[PDB]
């Protein structure tokens with residue numbers, strides 16, 4: 001009867017909290033501590049609506065013992081994405097997840113001042129010039145999946161059925177490796193190095209937000225996975241240092257080697273660079289492999305859209321008389337089917353759905369008397385707004401064409417926007433703004449252009465998969481496959 005005992009107190013307390021006209025409204029739930037982890041972790045945009053139809057734009061909900069004050073729409077964007085440091089912490093929300101996976105010292109295992117420069121150091125491999133050297137590497141890597149991978153084998157076969165839960169994560173990590181990390185880190189993925197990243201993934205799971213370490217196999221296998229992979233990168237670092245092979249514009253390992261001394265002259269360690277390398281590779285590999293998976297599916301549901309984005313690239317190549325191997329970075333900038341498709345795929349399917357900070361001193365919510373106390377979490381969600389009749393009409397319609405017809409601030413890593421209020425914020429905003437956006441459109445952009453150029457495909461049933469949210473990012477439920485045929 002320690003069933004009534006918690007029930008009666010958590011129940012009676014749930015009503016207690018109703019009183020305070022200074023605390024945002026809270027969603028009801030029957031389980032103590034567990035809260036709405038059910039309804040939210042399964043379909044959270046419905047859940048958001050199922051709360052806005054009741055409470056408007058501002059509200060809260062329990063989540064595995066932790067409070068999550070929400071704020072929808074461009075006003076929520078300003079409230080969380082642009083909070084300054086003395087009220088919200090982005091590390092105190094993302095720490096227990098990313099750190100055990102990437103390693104100490106970097107990303108969220110350091111103060112914000114540190115993180116700001118790591119994002120600056122990174123950006124030295126993310127320039128207009130880098131992207132020109134990456135396009136053909138990324139492309140040729142793709143084509144090498146098309147010819148050597150059992151899902152395609154385009155030099156033997158002419159029709160097939162490729163799983164996008166396999167093709168895209170492998171193509172994504174292979175193209176990221178080959179371009180960001182260079183040829184030896186890519187050649188070393190022949191080995192089931194991949195198995196080590198599989199071991200690292202299975203411990204990069206939302207459950208880390210509460211259970212980041214406990215004595216289980218995939219926990220210790222993740223710990224060991226991070227140790228083996230950093231030391232691999234720590235080995236590439238040492239081997240190109242002592243070789244004198246540090247080329248300040250080529251890879252991201254280079255660029256990180258050069259620039260990795262802080263404002264106060266303090267020096268990132270060899271492992272700290274390796275960990276940050278791990279985070280970068282893993283973060284970008286998830287969010288990019290997802291987006292290419294979806295725009296592969298959606299183009300298979302509306303195969304007309306492969307033909308738009310196809311004819312666009314042959315008009316450019318016919319002006320160059322130069323085949324696909326002569327399709328450059330600046331040519332990506334002139335193919336708006338590709339970019340709007342990616343832009344649309346990111347509207348319909350932003351990879352992160354919730355975005356947290358934790359509250360570090362009481363924070364007054366604007367035009368309310370609600371104050372978030374030290375202890376609760378804030379949650380923006382550019383995703384809700386990405387698929388609301390409020391901000392886009394026919395959010396259901398995968399419409400790449402819909403994309404036709406404030407100055408700046410620099411927190412540390414180059415100039416970003418001061419404006420956060422756009423309904424469309426796939427890459428976030430503020431000091432935690434993403435730095436791989438333009439890079440992602442070079443990847444997704446070459447994946448996409450290469451696929452369409454060689455492959456025409458459909459998806460059987462014209463049923464686009466339902467989305468899953470068990471995981472760190474949002475992915476199609478399998479069987480998520482594509483029925484393809486060589487174009488020639």
Ligand SMILES: CC[C@@H](C)n1ncn(-c2ccc(N3CCN(c4ccc(OC[C@H]5CO[C@](Cn6cncn6)(c6ccc(Cl)cc6Cl)O5)cc4)CC3)cc2)c1=O
Nearest residue numbers: 037041094107206279280283284287352354469470471472
């Ligand atoms: C398991 C039981 C089941 C019933 N259930 N019950 C509840 N839930 C649930 C709850 C919460 C969540 N999540 C979803 C994921 N979410 C989340 C994911 C990523 C994230 O990322 C923010 C930061 C840290 O990681 C990166 C991701 N990234 C950004 N750009 C590219 N990747 C990041 C930033 C920088 C670097 Cl270097 C790497 C990375 Cl990974 O940004 C924040 C929140 C938290 C809530 C999912 C399911 C369930 O599945």
Ligand code: HEM
Nearest residue numbers: 280284287288351355426427428431432433434435436440
């Ligand atoms: C389509 C692909 C991507 C999407 C949709 C995406 C999304 C996001 C979002 C929403 C944030 C803000 C998180 C917050 O404010 O809480 C963010 C930040 C970030 N992203 Fe991306 N990202 C993508 C690609 C990448 C890639 C390829 C990389 C690395 C090469 C990367 C690295 C980062 C980093 C380092 C941050 C900084 C977070 C911080 O400063 O705290 N992202 N991203």
